[PDB]
Amino acid sequence: ALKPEDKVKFRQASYTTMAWNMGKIKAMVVDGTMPFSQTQVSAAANVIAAIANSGMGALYSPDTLGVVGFKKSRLKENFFQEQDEVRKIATNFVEQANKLAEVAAMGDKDEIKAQFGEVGKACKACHEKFREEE
Amino acid sequence: ALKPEDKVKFRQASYTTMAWNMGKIKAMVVDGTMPFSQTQVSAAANVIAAIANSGMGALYSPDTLGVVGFKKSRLKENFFQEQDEVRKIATNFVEQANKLAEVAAMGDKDEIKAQFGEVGKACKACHEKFREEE
Ligand code: HEC
Ligand code: HEC
């Protein structure tokens, strides 16, 4: 298997990778601080959908509590008590991530904007329950 | 724009994310230390193709030399002198990553194994020239 420190590293890396690509979509379709490119918005959405489907469940085990990956894990222990809540939030995120990739393929800015907001809410929902605010 | 420390963080995260997914393909089709699942091999290949197409070129600027992202950047300065070599290696990696995703979709273990070896060589080619060995 993976050691705990690998699980933390790989999940921190995965989330950081998604944040870079979320930021590019935000810049092009929400803030307009970057010219809208279909191929780049699509490419960024595809990373988010791909990581969402990569089975990150395997990187969550109680032996990762308090472990340093890149940094000390910010996973809260309540993650392991609230499995109904974890499933609800994770399955919503996967569903929204897929939809974002589907609409970013052909969509205009308004459609992508709507789908992007649903993914952002899904990221935030998990953070609000299961990530330490520092 | 992004600060240098963000560029290093995002590129380290991106490569670490790809290494997790490479490791899963290796386990299932090379070492057989994990039972072969089509959907999981495909899901892992799709992450690699998606990150390969995410325009990581934007995360390489000379102001990132020696900068801490998660860790001190291991980018070598010769990256900025050997642009012909960078282009050759990067375009090969993108091409091999796409092919891996295409064959992992329907492929058997032998086809994926062949495509996986081409991606692994492409990762290594860039490391050999432009990443400090520590
Ligand atoms: C639970 C189902 C989550 C979903 C969906 C997303 N994130 Fe998250 N994130 C989560 C946890 C439990 C943690 C802490 C991981 C750890 O072990 O430390 C995180 C962390 C991040 C980070 C910080 C990464 C780091 O380098 O320390 C970022 C930038 C982040 N997450 C972003 C992010 C985005 C953009 C998401 C949707 C696209 C997203 N996360 C979803 C839990 C969950
Ligand atoms: C150049 C075109 C590259 C290709 C293709 C790949 N990698 Fe790489 N990698 C590269 C550099 C310049 C660096 C250092 C980045 C920095 O600023 O430190 C890396 C680093 C890695 C790492 C370490 C990440 C960390 O957390 O410090 C890993 C695990 C890694 N790279 C893996 C990897 C894999 C699996 C690739 C193909 C699928 C791959 N890299 C390609 C340059 C390049």
- Chain A residues near residue B19 by CB distance under 8 angstroms: 10
Put simply, the answer to whether A50 touches B47 (Cβ < 8 Å) is yes
Helix then strand count (H, E) for chain B reads 4, 0
Is B22 in contact with B115 (CB distance < 8 Å)? Answer: no
Protein residue closest via CA to atom 33 of ligand 2? B15
What distance in Å separates the CA atoms of residue B114 and residue B99, rounded to the nearest whole number?
Answer: 10
Which residue, by CA, sits nearest to atom 16 of ligand 2? B73
Question: Quick one: how far is CA A131 from the chain centroid?
Answer: 13
Chain A residue numbers touching B51 (CB-CB < 8 A):
17, 47, 50
**Inter-chain contact B13–A12, Cβ cutoff 8 Å?**
yes
What is the number of other CB atoms lying within 10 angstroms of the CB of residue B16? 20
A96 token code pair: 């929204």
Question: Which ligand minimizes its atom distance to the CA of B134?
Answer: 2
How many CB atoms are closer than 10 A to CB A10? Answer: 23
**Is-contact B26 A59, C-beta < 8 A?**
no
Task: Please state, in angstroms and rounded to a whole number, the distance separating the CA atoms of residues B62 and B83.
Answer: 13
**Is B72 in a helix, a strand, or coil?**
strand
What's the N-to-C CA distance of chain B in angstroms? 29
**Does B60 appear as a known binding residue?**
no
Interface test with A, best of B3, B16, B18 (most A CBs within 10 A): B16
Residue of B79, B123, B129 to mutate, ligand 2, most atoms within 8 A of C-beta: B123
How many residues are there in chain B? Answer: 134
3-state secondary structure (DSSP) of residue A68:
strand
Provide CB contacts within 8 A for A134, sequence distance 6+: A74
Per-residue tokens: B125: 């080619």
Does the distance separating the beta carbons of A51 and B44 come in below 8 Å? no
* Alpha carbon of B60: minimum distance to chain A alpha carbons (Å): 14
Between CA B17 and CA B24, with CA B22 as vertex, the angle to 5 degrees is: 100
Q: How many residues belong to chain A?
A: 134
Residue closest via CA to ligand 2's atom 1 equals: B126
Angle between helices A83-106 and A109-130 (to 10 degrees): 160
Instruction: Say which residues have a Cβ less than 8 Å from residue A68's Cβ, sequence separation at least 6.
Output: A5, A8
- Contact (Cβ atoms closer than 8 angstroms) between residue B52 and residue B97: yes
Ligand 1 within 6 A of A22 CB?
yes
Q: How many CA atoms, within 13 angstroms, populate the side-chain half-sphere of residue B111?
A: 14
Closest ligand to A115 CA?
1
Instruction: Report the distance separating Cα A36 and Cα A25, nearest Å.
Output: 9
Tokens of B11: 């590129």
A75 forms bridges with which residues in the sheet? A131
Q: Which residue in the set A16, A44, A46 is minimally distant from B13, CB to CB?
A: A16
How far is residue B3 from each of residues B8, B67, B105, B108, measured CA to CA in Å? 9, 10, 37, 43
Beta bridge partners of B131: B75
Q: How many helices (H) and strands (E) does chain A have?
A: 4, 0
User: Does the CA dihedral A91-A27-A42-B108 come out positive or negative?
Assistant: negative
What is the spatial distance between Cα B9 and Cα A121, in angstroms, rounded to a whole number?
24
> Of the ligands numbered here, which is closest to the C-alpha atom of B20?
2
Which amino acid type is present at position B4? P
